[PDB]
Amino acid sequence: QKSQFAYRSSKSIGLVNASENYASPPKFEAISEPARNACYSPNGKLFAYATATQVVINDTESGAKLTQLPAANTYELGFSPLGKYLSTWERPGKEADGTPKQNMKVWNTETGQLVFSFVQRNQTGWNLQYTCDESLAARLVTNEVHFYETGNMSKGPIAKLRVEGISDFALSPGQNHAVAVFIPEKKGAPASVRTYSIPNFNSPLSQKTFFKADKVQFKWNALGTSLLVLTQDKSNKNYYGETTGQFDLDREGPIHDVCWNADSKEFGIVYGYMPAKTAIFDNRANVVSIIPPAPRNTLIFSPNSRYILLAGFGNLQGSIDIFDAANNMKKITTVEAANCTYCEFSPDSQFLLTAVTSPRLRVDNSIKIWHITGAPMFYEEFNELYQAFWRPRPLN
């Protein structure tokens, strides 16, 4: 329909229908206060932006304001998978008497009701995780993991997890709800990774342990069946879990990016000291494609799982290449976006957005939308641009 994206600069904030000669939906206008943050719901039906005083939820079709949240001093925002809940991280603190304040609260989007409120100090892993049906939520306590019913989480944890000494965890986005958890290294014991079905707390699905591991990184695919695991000062190594006791490098050095494919059939890796080589796999850990060493640090799959992007960010001279899984890994396009700090396919995988953002860069902030062929369709100069992103659509 309309190729809509959002933008927020130091000067303004708005939604832009690229199919409409780049105009905003008629019923849209921001708050008195300057915006400090913004985001879309996973299905792109809603838009939220944060100002000092309040938080406003709009309709991405009309731009019409829908909901008002009395959330002040916010820094982070997050939509639940079906956008029926929105979480707001504030900066932590203590109450008049001395009580720690409820930094992050959960809100309803069609009633504007404060359903819940937690105390937290971290910004990393702040939000609740959710199932895809948005029926279950998950919080992280020392040496425990809590589960909730999203409909009625006020009553408390409907379920808890047995295992002890949990450092981080990650839910499954499959049809049937599953969990993946991690235990940091202690004395006389290595780190460990665990998977559980939510029905089965009693019966683990995987129980693996890992050494010289203080940290970890989980990467489920769209189908909650397979799961990548990454051990990460002196060394880094990459593992694989497939739920079920399943385990499955050509260049010595760091892995720069790890990414699944939208169809959950393939995945790729940007690894080793530069120029970084790139390898595409299958759901089995077998190579499909070997992209030769190039100055790249970032890999992205197109939503339609047809195109593969390979770029270099975090520095100047940032080019972009686009490869085609269907055409024998042909390259069809090479563009450059120097100092690009953000890049993303349009929902229909036909266009490509690039941007340069502050404070990751205080010079040359801009927006540029590209065809999949290489032909630009838009460009806009900013002084201090903060974010710019597509309005996500499902199964277009």
How far apart are the C-alpha atoms of 284 and 276, rounded to whole Å?
Answer: 23
Residue 92 carries which side chain, given as an amino acid letter? P
Query: How do beta strands 218-220 and 342-345 pair?
Result: unpaired
Q: Which of 386, 363, 389, 388 is nearest to 75 (CA)?
A: 386
How far apart are the C-alpha atoms of 24 and 187, rounded to whole Å?
Answer: 58
How far apart are the C-alpha atoms of 309 and 311, rounded to whole Å?
Answer: 7
Structural contact between residues 301 and 268, judged by C-beta atoms closer than 8 angstroms = yes
User: What are the start-end ranges of the E strands in 41-82?
Assistant: 46-51, 55-59, 65-69, 74-79
How far apart are the C-alpha atoms of 101 and 394, rounded to whole Å?
Answer: 37
DSSP 85-116: EEEEEE---B-TTSPBP--EEEEESSS--EEE
Place of tokens 């277009």: 396
Which three-class secondary structure state does DSSP give residue 20? helix
Query: How do beta strands 178-183 and 191-197 pair?
Result: antiparallel
Query: How do beta strands 287-294 and 129-130 pair?
Result: unpaired
Domains in the chain, number = 1
Structural contact between residues 321 and 331, judged by C-beta atoms closer than 8 angstroms = yes
Tell me, in Å, the resolution of the deposited structure: 2.5
Q: How many whole angstroms from its chain centre is CA 278?
A: 22
Structural contact between residues 128 and 138, judged by C-beta atoms closer than 8 angstroms = yes
DSSP 116-155: EEE----STT-SPEE-TTS-EEEEEETTEEEEEESTT-TT
- The pair of structure tokens assigned to 98 is 């001395």
- Note the helical H segments in the chain: none
How far apart are the C-alpha atoms of 207 and 226, rounded to whole Å?
Answer: 15
How far apart are the C-alpha atoms of 154 and 261, rounded to whole Å?
Answer: 36
Domain region containing 109: 1-396
Residue 349 carries which side chain, given as an amino acid letter? S
Tell me if the bond preceding 359 is cis, omega within 30° of 0. yes
Count other C-beta atoms under 10 Å from residue 201's C-beta.
15
Q: How far apart are the first and last CA of the chain?
A: 9
How far apart are the C-alpha atoms of 123 and 75, rounded to whole Å?
Answer: 9
Tell me the C-alpha to C-alpha distance, in Å, between residue 331 and each of 229, 269, 320, 373: 30, 17, 11, 10
Structural contact between residues 310 and 321, judged by C-beta atoms closer than 8 angstroms = yes
**Long-range residue pairs from 86-92, CB within 8 A, at least 24 positions apart, any chain:** 86/48, 86/55, 86/57, 87/126, 87/127, 87/128, 88/50, 88/55, 89/120, 89/123, 89/126, 89/127, 92/119, 92/120, 92/121
* Backbone angles phi and psi of 18, in degrees to 5: -65, -25
- The pair of structure tokens assigned to 82 is 């079906």
Handedness of CA 160, 163, 164, 167 (dihedral sign): negative
